[PDB]
Amino acid sequence: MVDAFLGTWKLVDSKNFDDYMKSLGVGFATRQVASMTKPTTIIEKNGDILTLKTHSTFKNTEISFKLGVEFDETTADDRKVKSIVTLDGGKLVHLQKWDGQETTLVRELIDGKLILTLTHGTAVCTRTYEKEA
Ligand SMILES: CCCCC/C=C\C/C=C\C/C=C\C/C=C\CCCC(=O)O
Numbered sequence: 001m002v003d004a005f006l007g008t009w010k011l012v013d014s015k016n017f018d019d020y021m022k023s024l025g026v027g028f029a030t031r032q033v034a035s036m037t038k039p040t041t042i043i044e045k046n047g048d049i050l051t052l053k054t055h056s057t058f059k060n061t062e063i064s065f066k067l068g069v070e071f072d073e074t075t076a077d078d079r080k081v082k083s084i085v086t087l088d089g090g091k092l093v094h095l096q097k098w099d100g101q102e103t104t105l106v107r108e109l110i111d112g113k114l115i116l117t118l119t120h121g122t123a124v125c126t127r128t129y130e131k132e133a
Contacts, residue, residue, distance in 0.1 A: 007043065018031050023120045023123040033058050038056070067087065093105075
């Protein structure tokens with residue numbers, strides 16, 4: 001079910017990431033560095049366990065989870081959240097909850113590119129990743 005998402009992906013387009021970060025309360029200096037970073041995202045599976053790595057010159061993260069099972073997560077911007085990842089309409093949907101807030105990180109494949117849509121508050125960021133061979 002998740003298999004077309006698996007692999008190594010490189011950021012190739014970003015829209016409204018500053019809006020998203022600002023909505024989350026990220027400080028200017030961090031936003032500034034983040035806006036010039038091009039992360040690599042690695043998604044791998046081992047049975048029912050998915051591992052999602054995000055690597056850059058600034059911050060790195062790694063999470064492991066089972067689809068449909070809540071997990072604790074500490075995000076790149078240091079939020080301690082309750083998370084769940086599920087497939088919905090063929091999209092990989094990641095929901096984070098903390099302090100009564102929510103944000104969604106939705107991944108979908110369009111023409112072989114991975115489109116990540118980040119929503120918090122009214123801010124909607126779209127980032128596009130291409131597969132590395
Ligand atoms: C480890 C993330 C590396 C790239 C971004 C650089 C710095 C992170 C700093 C702040 C960003 C604020 C919120 C983190 C939440 C989502 C970022 C996902 C970006 C992506 O997956 O495209």
